RNA sequence: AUGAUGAGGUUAAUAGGUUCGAGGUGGAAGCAUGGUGACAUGUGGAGCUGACGAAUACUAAUCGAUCGAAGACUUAAU
RNA sequence: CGCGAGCUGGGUUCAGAACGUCGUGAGACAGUUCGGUCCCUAUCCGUCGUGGGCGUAGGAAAUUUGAGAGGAGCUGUCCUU
RNA sequence: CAAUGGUAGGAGAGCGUUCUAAGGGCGUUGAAGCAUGAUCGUAAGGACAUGUGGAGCGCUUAGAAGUGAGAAUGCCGGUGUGAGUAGCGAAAGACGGGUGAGAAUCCCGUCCACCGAUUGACUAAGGUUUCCAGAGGAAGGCUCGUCCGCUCUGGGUUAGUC
RNA sequence: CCGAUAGUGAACCAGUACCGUGAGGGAAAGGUGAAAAGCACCCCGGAAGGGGAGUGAAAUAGAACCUGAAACCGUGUGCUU
RNA sequence: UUAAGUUAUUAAGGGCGCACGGUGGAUGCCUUGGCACUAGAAGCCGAUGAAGGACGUUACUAACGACGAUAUGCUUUGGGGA
């Protein structure tokens, strides 16, 4: 597994942040290496959401951030609720995958490979 | 570390400065030299 | 630790014969006809 | 038969810009533009501006087709460097050259 | 180190994911029972599990580009 | 008395202090004693590893011979005779 | 017919540079400088041609010298080499939206993180407009910059008791 | 007698930028063109720059502006490796 | 066709010559300013407040001159002629 130029605690925090953000937004722009690493994390989250039981929910709460989503009609729910209530339903028949990576060119401030990582 | 020149307005105007220079003959010498040179600042 | 002599112009230009960049790995985009980076999204159109 | 464009005193070191300028010498205008837009060096947008200016000069001043146009020659020579300094250890100051470049691109239809 | 080397690019098991294991840990969570309570027992070798083994195209190797021969003379055997 | 741009810094050879001794003294002794800043981003040859170019008279894939080169090269005890 | 290696060193003859005197000349039909050339003399060095340049300059004889540079760890300037090398100055960021020609770097939001006898709040010295608001991005910010302690324009400090 | 490294330190807002706590120390920096006639308009570009057009005898006289050496940096090639 | 022998071509880059550019500010030409003198004035100024400054003053507004609150100047006499 990659190190991403970061200590173990900082890498863990950054990966769970990136996972939560992809869950909230359904698609994010980031670096290639970080997307290659967050793919596994978010996909294991969707796997836990697909089981749906309480122990699995308690386990997925270990990784997700306490973030709030405002739906339409002023509907409000957490990232955990979105994981177990809308995204698990979207992938009940799919047996892996769950994410796609679209390489984009190098950014300007570095030569960093910017990528879109989305949900599928 | 503590360097030299800890500035202080009172001490600067008391040790140097017009009234201190005018209080001795040698101080008046330095003002005369600076005026002779065309110096814009005397003390 | 420190150079003993100059580096002549000949020696310098010999040393930097391999100091160059390569052309991008680019391909024409099938949808829009403009050049793009292979395995990257066409930035002019946004396809594939 | 020939069109010119010069960008003078570009605040990029000519040794750095000549790397990108080595890629488009003698190439077709379309391929040159694609190379410039896809290479990730600081000098690529600056050279692209000069290329587009030369192409516009061709079209507007001489009425030549910008489909038969090749990058006849492309070079950068030195401009008036700016002299700066960096405070190093023990009170010493080391010089810094911020060099500048005169970038020239001429395009041609390769005829007479 | 980077080049390089080697395994692969859909007519595909290369990596990820998913599923099944090996090894490791040592008995999850939620309930139920017992105890005044700290706790204990049961459900139940349970749960979890980087890198190791297998299967599976679900995701990414989906489009395409570039380089790369036509084989010199002389003599002798043929 | 190989090797400090590879290391150390105990001895030795600055500035401090002290003992014996010498000098009227300032000070001195190859007599002791305690303490006392070891800088340098490697240009060239050289060396250890790794790539590209061209050549090897067509263009390639693989398997090779070995001109040469390097490496290894030590030795104990016990039993039997 | 004879002589002609040469250092310290002696002697002689000359080449150029600036200026002055007198004579004689050349110049916008293009002077001096600069550049190039396959030209001439025994050397110092002298011409010619053609480009550049755009107003001054040779020649003769003779007078004066701030009269000739490759070296002084020379002085002043310019430019290299090392080299696209060392470094980029203690530390945690991620993503979404926004603005722009351009965004890792500016603005907003959420989560995360660091200090908290303090990285918080006053206030002496010291500094002098850096303070605020609009606009800006040449230079300065060790990168970037749409931003700033930078640039521009216009503002801002109220005491009988401090 | 000097003609911008000379001649005053200072031909130019000079005893000034700047240095120092202070006495003190002390620079660097002249030249478009005869006339500003200082490039109206078009085009690329956010701008900077540029290419046309035009002014001018001349615009590689375009404001860093007379001439424009050498070092140094590039781009093409004839002959070579 | 095979054997034996011989010799190209290559230029990643480099070298020399040439051509065209850039940088840079030598050189030439020039003078705003200096340097050394000659002849002739003159050889002090201040409590009637000097020498040097500070701060102001313009229609707008920085800096140099010029001038003080009568302030980018007032009166007078004499030149002076758009
Ligand atoms: Mg210091």
CATH code where residue D7 lies: 3.90.470.10
Which candidate, A79, A40, A37, places its Cα nearest to that of A61?
A79
Q: Which residues pair with A70 in a beta bridge?
A: A76
A46, A100, B9, B12, B24 from B27: Cα distances, Å: 88, 85, 20, 15, 5
Which residues span the domain enclosing D17?
2-110
Query: Which superfamily does A1-120 belong to?
Result: Ribosomal protein L17 (3.90.1030.10)
> A84 is written with which tokens?
């177990």
Work out how many domains chain D is built from and give that number.
1
Sequence-ordered list of residues with C-beta below 8 angstroms from that of A66, at least 6 positions apart, any chain: A78, A79
Nucleotides of I under 7 A from a protein CB: 12-15, 21-24, 51-54
Which candidate, D14, D32, D13, places its Cα nearest to that of D23?
D32
Contact: A103, C43; criterion CB under 8 Å: no
A102 near C CB under 8 A: yes
Distance B11 CA to ligand 1 centre (A): 25
Q: Which residues of D touch C12 (CB under 8 A)?
A: none
Residue B25: which region, alpha, beta or left (left: phi > 0; alpha: psi -120 to 50)? alpha
3-state secondary structure of A99: strand
Smallest CA–CA distance, residue A113 to chain D, in Å, is 11
Which candidate, D34, A116, A32, A112, places its Cα nearest to that of C44?
D34
3-state secondary structure of A35: helix
Domains and CATH numbers, chain B: 1-43 (1.10.287.3980)
Tell me, what DSSP letter sits at residue D26?
T
> C8 is written with which tokens?
């002549």
CB-based contact A80:A71 (threshold 8 Å) = no
Could you state, in order of their start, the residue ranges of all structural domains in chain A? 1-120
Contact: C23, D20; criterion CB under 8 Å: no
**A94/A64 Cα distance (integer angstroms):** 22
Contact partners for chain B, using 3 or more CB pairs closer than 8 A, are none
Which candidate, D85, D81, D86, D84, places its Cα nearest to that of D102?
D81
Q: Which nucleotide is nearest to C6 (CA to C1')?
A: G81
Contact: C24, D35; criterion CB under 8 Å: yes
**D75/D24 Cα distance (integer angstroms):** 10
CB-based contact C33:C41 (threshold 8 Å) = no
Distance D102 CA to ligand 1 centre (A): 38
């Amino acid at each position: 597994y990659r190190k991403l130029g970061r200590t173990s605690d900082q890498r863990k925090a950054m990966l769970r942040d990136l996972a939560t953000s992809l869950i909230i937004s359904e698609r994010i722009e980031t670096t290639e290496a970080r997307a290659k690493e967050v793919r596994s994390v978010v996909e294991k989250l969707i796997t836990l959401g697909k089981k749906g039981d309480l122990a699995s929910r308690r386990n997925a709460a270990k990784t997700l951030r306490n973030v709030e989503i405002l739906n339409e009609d002023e509907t409000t729910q957490t990232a955990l609720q979105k994981l177990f209530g809308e995204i698990a339903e979207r992938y009940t028949e799919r047996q892996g995958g769950y994410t796609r990576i679209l390489k984009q060119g190098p950014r300007r401030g570095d030569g960093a490979e910017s990528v879109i990582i989305e949900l599928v | 570390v503590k360097r030299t020149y800890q500035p202080n307005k009172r001490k600067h105007s008391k040790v140097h400065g017009f009234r201190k220079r005018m209080s001795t003959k040698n101080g008046r010498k330095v003002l005369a030299r600076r005026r002779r040179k065309g110096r814009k600042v005397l003390s | 630790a420190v150079p003993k002599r100059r580096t002549s112009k000949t020696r310098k230009n010999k040393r930097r014969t391999h100091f160059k960049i390569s052309v991008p790995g680019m391909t024409e985009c099938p949808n829009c006809g403009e050049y793009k980076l292979s395995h990257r999204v066409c930035k002019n159109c946004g396809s594939y | 038969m020939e069109a010119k464009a010069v960008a003078r005193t570009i605040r990029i070191a000519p040794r750095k810009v000549r790397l990108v300028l080595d890629l488009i010498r003698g190439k077709n205008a379309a391929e040159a533009i694609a190379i410039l837009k896809l290479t990730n060096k600081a000098s690529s947008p600056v050279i692209e501006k000069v290329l587009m200016s030369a192409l516009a000069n061709a079209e507007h001043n001489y009425d030549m087709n910008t489909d038969e146009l090749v990058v006849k020659e492309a070079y950068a020579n030195e401009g008036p460097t700016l002299k700066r300094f960096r405070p190093r250890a023990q009170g010493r100051a080391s010089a810094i050259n911020k060099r500048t470049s005169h970038i020239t691109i001429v395009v041609s239809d390769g005829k007479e």
